[PDB]
Design an enzyme around this catalytic site. Structure first.
Site, short mmCIF file in Angstrom:
data_model
loop_
_atom_site.label_atom_id
_atom_site.label_comp_id
_atom_site.label_asym_id
_atom_site.label_seq_id
_atom_site.Cartn_x
_atom_site.Cartn_y
_atom_site.Cartn_z
N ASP A 288 -2.52 5.67 -5.06
CA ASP A 288 -2.68 4.68 -4.00
C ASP A 288 -2.84 3.22 -4.42
O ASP A 288 -3.92 2.78 -4.83
CB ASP A 288 -3.89 5.15 -3.18
CG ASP A 288 -4.05 4.40 -1.90
OD1 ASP A 288 -4.93 4.81 -1.12
OD2 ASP A 288 -3.31 3.42 -1.67
N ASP B 41 0.73 -1.27 0.00
CA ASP B 41 0.00 0.00 0.00
C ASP B 41 0.76 1.33 0.00
O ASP B 41 1.23 1.77 1.05
CB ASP B 41 -0.93 -0.06 1.22
CG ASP B 41 -1.77 1.17 1.39
OD1 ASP B 41 -2.26 1.35 2.52
OD2 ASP B 41 -1.95 1.94 0.42
C1 LIG Z 1 -4.26 -1.88 1.94
C2 LIG Z 1 -4.85 -0.99 3.03
C3 LIG Z 1 -5.57 0.24 2.48
N1 LIG Z 1 -4.78 1.26 2.06
C4 LIG Z 1 -5.33 2.38 1.57
N2 LIG Z 1 -4.50 3.33 1.14
N3 LIG Z 1 -6.65 2.60 1.46
C5 LIG Z 1 -7.46 1.59 1.87
N4 LIG Z 1 -8.77 1.83 1.77
C6 LIG Z 1 -6.98 0.34 2.37
C7 LIG Z 1 -7.90 -0.80 2.59
C8 LIG Z 1 -8.46 -1.16 3.83
C9 LIG Z 1 -9.33 -2.28 3.93
C10 LIG Z 1 -9.64 -3.05 2.79
C11 LIG Z 1 -9.06 -2.70 1.50
C12 LIG Z 1 -8.21 -1.58 1.46
N5 LIG Z 1 -9.38 -3.48 0.34
C13 LIG Z 1 -8.84 -3.18 -1.02
C14 LIG Z 1 -7.49 -3.85 -1.31
C15 LIG Z 1 -6.72 -3.09 -2.39
O1 LIG Z 1 -5.71 -3.94 -2.88
C16 LIG Z 1 -4.89 -3.39 -3.89
C17 LIG Z 1 -10.27 -4.56 0.43
O2 LIG Z 1 -10.38 -5.50 -0.33
C18 LIG Z 1 -11.20 -4.32 1.64
C19 LIG Z 1 -12.67 -4.11 1.51
C20 LIG Z 1 -13.60 -5.08 1.06
C21 LIG Z 1 -14.93 -4.67 0.80
F1 LIG Z 1 -15.81 -5.56 0.36
C22 LIG Z 1 -15.36 -3.33 1.00
C23 LIG Z 1 -14.41 -2.41 1.46
F2 LIG Z 1 -14.73 -1.13 1.67
C24 LIG Z 1 -13.10 -2.78 1.73
O3 LIG Z 1 -10.52 -4.17 2.90
#
Ligand SMILES: CCc1nc(N)nc(N)c1-c1ccc2c(c1)N(CCCOC)C(=O)[C@H](c1cc(F)cc(F)c1)O2
Ligand SMILES: *[C@@H]1O[C@H](CO)[C@@H](O)[C@H](O)[C@H]1NC(C)=O
EC number: 3.4.23.15
Length: 333
Positions: A219, A31
């Site tokens: 990002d 990230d």
């Molecule tokens: C990697 C950490 C991270 N970094 C940043 N800069 N922004 C974020 N929003 C997140 C962040 C947090 C929780 C998450 C995810 C991202 N992601 C996206 C991963 C991106 O990979 C490249 C998910 O899969 C998920 C998640 C699942 C849902 F179904 C709905 C959501 F809102 C979030 O749980």
């Protein structure tokens, strides 16, 4: 060094890292949008179902572990995690580094039960590090073994077969195998954030958004391309999309013909086609199809700002240059 990444439904990209001695493996998202490293902790109460569903780091099984215990809370745009600090050796594609990371003990079902990955490896600057912990890339740079003070990202398109690499992150360079043409660089607005100046956003044949300029966070930890609520509402009214609880949809039969969306960065237009931003799961005019563009209001100092996540990186291989504080984009191959 390069790490193979797994692509899950085009919204989650993660690779493996080893922590401890012997190595305990974890799936983590690399990230650029954060600066800390964390994985689920064996101390995480099983009352948190997310902990029952992910690999848990157990200190009592690592002979290289170093206690610290300082509490930290990590706040992402879509969820929070809390825990304490710990130190141990981390393996990242052939490179070993002693790193301070957080052992999470509080991991909310929503959204983590929907996470294919276990934790996160922040590639952001220390200026954004919570608890002022030294970021993993800095520690790697300190070893003076990387050919270049940079790292690259390649996010492939989804694939219904276990043969194509979901993605690839290169530590110390860029892989020519996954991009063509030349890199075009854009200077960071300020070191400490992977954010650059964006001159304008156009939908179709008209720069109707971000006139006068705006911000863009690149990002790798974000699934989609995001903008402020105002901006998105406006962009979405142009595409003819309807706003739902968490996403924006358009009639599936309409998806294929939606217009191009462009992002003016460092004097060069980066264009996405409807194929690039809508999950074309059907052609039926009786089904809704989601767009890989969301609304997300990032608070200061960082925001207000647009965010160029996986939707944008899938199309443009991205290199993050620390020595020159700039970002480079090249057509992905
Ligand atoms: C990697 C950490 C991270 N970094 C940043 N800069 N922004 C974020 N929003 C997140 C962040 C947090 C929780 C998450 C995810 C991202 N992601 C996206 C991963 C991106 O990979 C490249 C998910 O899969 C998920 C998640 C699942 C849902 F179904 C709905 C959501 F809102 C979030 O749980
Ligand atoms: C935890 O790490 C910080 C930063 O390196 C250090 O200053 C602090 O003393 C450590 N805390 C303990 C009790 O180990």
């Amino acid at each position: 060094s390069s790490v193979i990444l797994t692509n899950y439904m085009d919204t989650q990209y993660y690779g493996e890292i080893g922590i401890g001695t012997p190595p305990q493996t974890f799936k983590v998202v690399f990230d650029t949008g954060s600066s800390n490293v964390w994985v689920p902790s064996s101390k995480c109460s099983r009352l948190y179902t997310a902990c029952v569903y992910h690999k848990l780091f157990d200190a009592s099984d690592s002979s290289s572990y170093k206690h610290n215990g300082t509490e930290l809370t990590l706040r992402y745009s879509t969820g929070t995690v809390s825990g304490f600090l710990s130190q141990d050796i981390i393996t990242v594609g052939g490179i070993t580094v002693t790193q301070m990371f957080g052992e999470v003990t509080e991991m909310p079902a929503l959204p983590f039960m929907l996470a294919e990955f276990d934790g996160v490896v922040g590639m952001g600057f220390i200026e954004q590090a919570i608890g002022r912990v030294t970021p993993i890339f800095d520690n790697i740079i300190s070893q003076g073994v990387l050919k270049e003070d940079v790292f690259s990202f390649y996010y492939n398109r989804d694939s219904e077969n276990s043969q194509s690499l979901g993605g690839q992150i290169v530590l110390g360079g860029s892989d020519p195998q996954h991009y063509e043409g030349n890199f075009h660089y854009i200077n960071l607005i300020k070191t400490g954030v992977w954010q650059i100046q964006m001159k304008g956003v156009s939908v179709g044949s008209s720069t109707l958004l971000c006139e006068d300029g705006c911000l863009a966070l690149v990002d790798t930890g974000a699934s989609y391309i995001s903008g402020s609520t105002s901006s998105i509402e406006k962009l979405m009214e142009a595409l003819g999309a309807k706003k739902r609880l968490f996403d924006y949809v358009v009639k599936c039969n309409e998806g294929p013909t939606l217009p191009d969306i462009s992002f003016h960065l460092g004097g060069k237009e980066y264009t996405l086609t409807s194929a690039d931003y809508v999950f074309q799961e059907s052609y039926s005019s009786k089904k809704l199809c989601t767009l890989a563009i969301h609304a997300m209001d990032i608070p200061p100092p960082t925001g207000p700002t647009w965010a160029l996540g996986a939707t944008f990186i899938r199309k443009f291989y991205t290199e993050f240059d620390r020595r020159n504080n700039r970002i480079g984009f090249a057509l992905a191959r």
